[PDB]
Amino acid sequence: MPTLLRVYIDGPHGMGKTTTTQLLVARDDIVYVPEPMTYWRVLGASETIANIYTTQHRLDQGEISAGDAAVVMTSAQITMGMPYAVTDAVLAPHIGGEAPPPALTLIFDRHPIAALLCYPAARYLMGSMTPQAVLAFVALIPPTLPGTNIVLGALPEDRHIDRLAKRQRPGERLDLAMLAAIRRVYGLLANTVRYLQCGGSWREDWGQLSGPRPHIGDTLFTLFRAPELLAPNGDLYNVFAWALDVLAKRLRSMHVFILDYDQSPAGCRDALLQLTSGMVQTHVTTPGSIPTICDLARTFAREMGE
Amino acid sequence: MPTLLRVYIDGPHGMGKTTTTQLLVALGSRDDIVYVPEPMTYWRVLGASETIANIYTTQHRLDQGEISAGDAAVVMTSAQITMGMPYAVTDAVLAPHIGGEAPPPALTLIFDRHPIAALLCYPAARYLMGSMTPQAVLAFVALIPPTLPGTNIVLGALPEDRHIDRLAKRPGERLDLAMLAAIRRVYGLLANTVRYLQCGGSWREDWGQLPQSNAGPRPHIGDTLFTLFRAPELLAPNGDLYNVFAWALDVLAKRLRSMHVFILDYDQSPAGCRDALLQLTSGMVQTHVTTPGSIPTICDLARTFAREMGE
Ligand SMILES: C#Cc1cn([C@@H]2O[C@H](CO)[C@@H](O)C2(F)F)c(=O)[nH]c1=O
Ligand SMILES: C#Cc1cn([C@@H]2O[C@H](CO)[C@@H](O)C2(F)F)c(=O)[nH]c1=O
Secondary structure, rough: OOEEEEEEEOOOOOOHHHHHHHOOOOOOEEEEEEOOOHHHHHHHOOHHHHHHHHHHHHHOOOOOOOHOOOOOHHHHHHHHHHHHHHHHHHHHHHEEEOOOOEEEEEEEEEHHHHHHOOOOOOOOOOOOOOOHHHHHHHHHHOOOOOEEEEEEEOOOHHHHHHHHHHHOOOOOOOOOOOOOOHHHHHHHHHHHHHHHHHHHHHHHHHHHHHOOOOOHOOOOHHOOOOOHHHHOOOEEEEHHHHHHHHHHHHHHOOOOEEEEEEOOOHHHHHHHHHHHOOOEEEOOOOOHHHHHHHHHHHHHHHHHHO | OEEEEEEOOOOOOOOOHHHHHHHOOOOOHHHHHHEOOOHOOOHHHOOOHHHHHHHHHHHHHHHHOOOHHHHHHHHHHHHHHHHHHHHHHHHHHHHHEEEEOOOOEEEEEEEEEEHHHHHHHHHHHHHOOOOOHHHHHHHHHHOOOOOOOOOOOEEEOOHHHHHHHHHEEEEEEEEOOOHHHHHHHHHHHHHHHHHHHOOOHHHHHHHHHHOOOOOOOOOOHHHHHHHHOOHHHHOOOOEOOOOHHHHHHHHHHHHHHOOEEEEOOOOHHHHHHHHHHHHHHHHHHOEOOHHHHOOHHHHHHHHHHHHHHHH
């Protein structure tokens, strides 16, 4: 059966992700799946991004409670992740085991974990989502398929602020606190994958949060030493501990690649191209999978891309 | 390999599901059948504060016109996410233990509700009540976990008059007969949807045409869950579904079609329901487990869950 390469370009917004990749299919055997802006602004709800930034701004000003903001943020994040969740689910049966040239390369703008883990966790750090909601999203992260190659960004903070200022989505507000939270989350994400792959056991190391791989205090696990999640004696409730077991399973089999964005758009493009030589390809499951996947991807772009 | 029997008792609230589940479990030896309760403690305390009360209060304030549909939707959507969390995690932790479909089972697990109750049925019912968008319902559907082998779901049958009587007597709940009608309709649609799919129905082929299961002829698509999603919000200018929503229905078909549905008549005494459920288990699908230590592991998981979150 023919081979497929899936490449998810992810990481904090405002680094230059949607430019870099736009230049990458810029063709028959590569398809670019862009961010589903139309879903966010129109199809799923009205101006979800505006809704998100306005809610945080009003929380910050003290015009609404943490409680009101959390229910708003939570349902908004549901809208945000929907196109990623449907796409993953319809693609899943087509994905075979690990596998030469690929018959088809899909380059996605973001992986489901952006809306089902990273953004929720950042909003938690922003005081506008409960950690219990975050772990509800985590519990729903689809099982990690073979060949899940995820590209995360590296960019010094000052330069990132400069780029973000020019890359504001419709309805977005330039929020340096959110920028720092989302950068911390993705930093912790990269660390967490490494911790897990080198054989780290969160349950074994959990005691260190109260005291060769990253320290657990430098992974996503540290975020869930939140008091909401803990019994009167300090123990994590089992239901949350199980969500963390799921988090561990999902993240461990991801293939992370770091893309230096502190260079020219053509440079970023070339660097992304270089990275592909180490990415994992899979077979598809049926002979008709390749054109079906192509049609899915192109229909997504056409209908939901800006 | 030793075998496992998983049975999810589901359907509208107020039918006697929870009692039936306990009665059935009380028949078995302690360590060959385990009860996985509604995570009431999660709903009331651990996940958020009094979520059930929040749900019913919000619907009421919508009905009274004290809040907008928009405000009700964001509360209802967040609350439904909270409702489903323990179901999702439990399914995710059980999944790698389950083998292919397959003497008495080494272990029987009786669940109070399947993940689809919180990820599909209640959201769909709330959408019918005007307190959730159909887009959000389809987001929940997109997130329904892959259907494990040997997913036996038992749904309820019960005359509406007896059901209403049962509810008006036997929290945070408020007596809402409109919601009762909605959730009864939704589970009836569900039963039909499984039968429709297993009879080879293709919603895309039948789209233009807009109970019981494991028996009978193929339902009309208008009597399945697919009919709920002919909503103006989901339709393109040309009048077809946007592809994104269409893909969510494809997921809906995929998840439901491999399920094994049974209908239990609740219009009888608690012991009657128990024995009826017991007879029904005879035609239910078991699975192998993936490791020998899966049986005790699964057992501990079920008991830990029950202890922490059961009422
Ligand atoms: C995927 C995704 C998400 C994107 N976004 C935002 O949408 C835009 C994506 O470019 C950007 O403003 C953002 F990244 F901040 C969210 O707020 N939440 C998400 O879950
Ligand atoms: C599972 C479940 C759910 C239960 N419930 C309610 O919880 C209560 C106990 O089951 C009952 O009032 C109910 F079933 F209606 C919801 O409102 N939503 C759900 O998703």
